[PDB]
């Protein structure tokens, strides 16, 4: 059963740069090696077949190389739409086997998030829970501190975060932080605030509202 190893599973590169993703097989596979790109939405595209042959409709920035056990996919100059996980596949033996994947992180200029806060809807309150959402839009890099303050009391343990995949045009991230309280807790307090610290902000930005 032939093993495909993509040792480096997380790779970062600047737009314009040359990028190389490597793949080695447990035994020789005589150039019977294909490359796929999986987009964040789960769509899979064939890029390269039989080591070197560019699939129809694939930019020439993509090339494949190697022989025996060792294969590489090269992107001559990185574009924003190249954000993906890349997989190698051997067809020398059955079963067809695949590498672990290489996720390509894209490096670009710093951008601060624009920040938005949203109170819970009455439609949620009526059934006993209050979700308070803080949005960080279109920033780079991914590292960001979101702190919740309720009437200026720093919060812990009562919020969850989620982050988009890097955008295919502007290579930025967006992040949501949801603060979850009981209706009863939400209503004992006046000011809800989220404070964002990020490299692109010369000092933290706070967005807040008052209940009632």
């Amino acid at each position: 059963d032939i093993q495909m190893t993509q040792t480096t599973s997380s790779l970062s590169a600047s737009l314009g740069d040359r990028v190389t993703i490597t793949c080695s097989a447990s035994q020789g596979i005589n150039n019977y090696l294909n490359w796929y790109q999986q987009k964040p939405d789960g769509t899979v595209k064939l890029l390269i077949y039989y080591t070197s042959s560019l699939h129809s409709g694939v930019p020439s920035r993509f090339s494949g190389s190697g022989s025996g056990t060792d294969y590489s996919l090269t992107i001559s100059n990185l574009e924003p739409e190249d954000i993906a996980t890349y997989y190698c596949q051997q067809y020398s033996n059955l079963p067809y086997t695949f590498g672990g994947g290489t996720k390509l992180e894209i490096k670009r200029t710093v951008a601060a998030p624009s920040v938005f806060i949203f109170p819970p809807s009455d439609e949620q309150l009526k059934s006993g829970t209050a979700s308070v959402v803080c949005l960080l839009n279109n920033f780079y890099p991914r590292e960001a501190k979101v702190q919740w303050k309720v009437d200026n009391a720093l919060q812990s343990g009562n919020s969850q975060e989620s982050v988009t995949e890097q955008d295919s045009k502007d290579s930025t991230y967006s992040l949501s932080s949801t603060l979850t309280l009981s209706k009863a807790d939400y209503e004992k307090h006046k000011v809800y605030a989220c404070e964002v610290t990020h490299q692109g902000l010369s000092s933290p930005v706070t967005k807040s509202f008052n209940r009632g």
């Binding site: 796929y36 695949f98 809807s121 439609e123 949620q124 949005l135 989620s162």
Partner: protein, 216 residues
Amino acid sequence: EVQLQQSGPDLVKPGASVKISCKTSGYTFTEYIMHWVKQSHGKSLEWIGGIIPNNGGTSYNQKFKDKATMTVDKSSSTGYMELRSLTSEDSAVYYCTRREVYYYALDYWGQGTLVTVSSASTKGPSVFPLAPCESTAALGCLVKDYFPEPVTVSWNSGALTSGVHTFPAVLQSSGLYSLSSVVTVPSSNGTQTYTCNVDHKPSNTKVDKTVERKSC
């Protein structure tokens, strides 16, 4: 244009079977082998097997010989794969693909079918507006307390795509999923309305939630 349309997501019981479709268009079904690939959450691709449509002849990955059964149906131009005796290890996305010759490769891919193997029951999302109490405004939809994955969100029936971020779902301590979808618009372009369209196929739940701007 070649096209591989797979059945929708699936909640299944431990021990249950399930049968997945891949209806093909834009090529002679009989002239091309079909393979099936599995992808666990945050995982690599495992090849399951192939099937020659000309005659129904099959190859299987040894690891899946007891699990999976491929078939075709030349009239509907539709391949199938049945998974038997399901467990957690079968929670995955399953892709149908077409093999081409140039030198074999998988040159077209289905959008994939998310299978979740679980005891717990379907629950439809609650959909709540995200509206504010600068040079851009934002609003959105909170899509709370659903099981299993996935949901699709569009805005204005697929006519609003730009400025849109649908966040990946977090599993809450309740064992129910939640996510938000958001839209940003430059303050100027007041003109339009904002409705998020949420579809949870596992619960046959469709919901259009209009987000009241309350400009006046």
